[PDB]
Every structure is written in structure tokens, then in C-alpha cells.
Amino acid sequence: GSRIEREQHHLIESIEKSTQYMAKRRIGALISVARDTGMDDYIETGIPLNAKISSQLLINIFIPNTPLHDGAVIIKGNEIASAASYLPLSDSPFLSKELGTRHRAALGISEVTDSITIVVSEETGGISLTKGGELFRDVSEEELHKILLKELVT
Ligand SMILES: Cc1nn(C)c(C)c1CC(=O)Nc1ccccn1
């Protein structure tokens, strides 16, 4: 009851710290947090980790030209379920064309699941979020904290 609430805030803090580190260095990232709708089919596409959640591990996963970086990290429950997992690309023509594959993958998974997905752009270092087919582009740290707090702490 209260143990899961402490885990969710640790999940939020882990996302904030890792995205800040990667944004400063323009390291692309794609982190999808599953919810009610299971993402088990997409977890199976990646390399399984089943690891404890930490900002340190999230950073090490997305280091460029490493075995674990090319794809999405999926967080299920209180674990980093998989890395290098593949997410469906959205077919939306409304998505801006200056955004890349990570943004299109984050939008695609938000259209068929209720998951919260976070993106770090390797071109601009901007942090974006997707939920329910919508895109919050280049959010600030306050905006990111408010969205994650509302959507991840039940
Ligand atoms: C869904 C899918 N299956 N397969 C074989 C491909 C190539 C895709 C789409 C895709 O490129 N998704 C992606 C790209 C970057 C990060 C995360 N997902």
C-alpha cells in the first residue's frame, strides 16, 4: 500500500535524474512505463533485464553504440523489464517531421496502450512525453515532475 507509493516516487526520481543526465549530453532515450494495459508482447521483443529501477542503470542502458541502447526500455511494475525493445510506430501525419523515430515510437505505443512514455531527443536534448495518443513536446522539469507525479503515483 505505502511501499508501492515509495517505489513509484523512486521510479519518478529515477526517470528525472536519468533524463536530465542524458538531456545535457544529447543522448537519445525512450522509456515506456506500463500501467493497466500490459505491454508483455513488446517486453518479449527486447533483451530481458528484470532489474531494480535506478537512474544509474537507466543511464548505462542508453549509452550510444552499446548492446542495450538501440530501442526502448519498458518498466513494468517495479522493475526495468527489458531494454532494446521495439514499439509500434504511429502513422499520424500530425506528428511534426522534425521529430524522429523515438518520438514516433512513443506516440505509437501511447495510441494502443495507456502507458506513459518519455523521450530524450538526441538532436535537441528536449524531453517529450506521450499518453493516450497525445504528445507533450519539450517539457520543462516542473512540467515533467507534475505529469509523472499525476500519472505514476496512484
Ligand atoms: C514495431 C517494430 N518492429 N520492428 C521490427 C520495427 C522496425 C518496428 C518499428 C520501430 O522501428 N520501432 C522503434 C524504433 C526505435 C525505438 C523503438 N521502437
Ligand SMILES: [Cl-]
Ligand atoms: Cl531523437
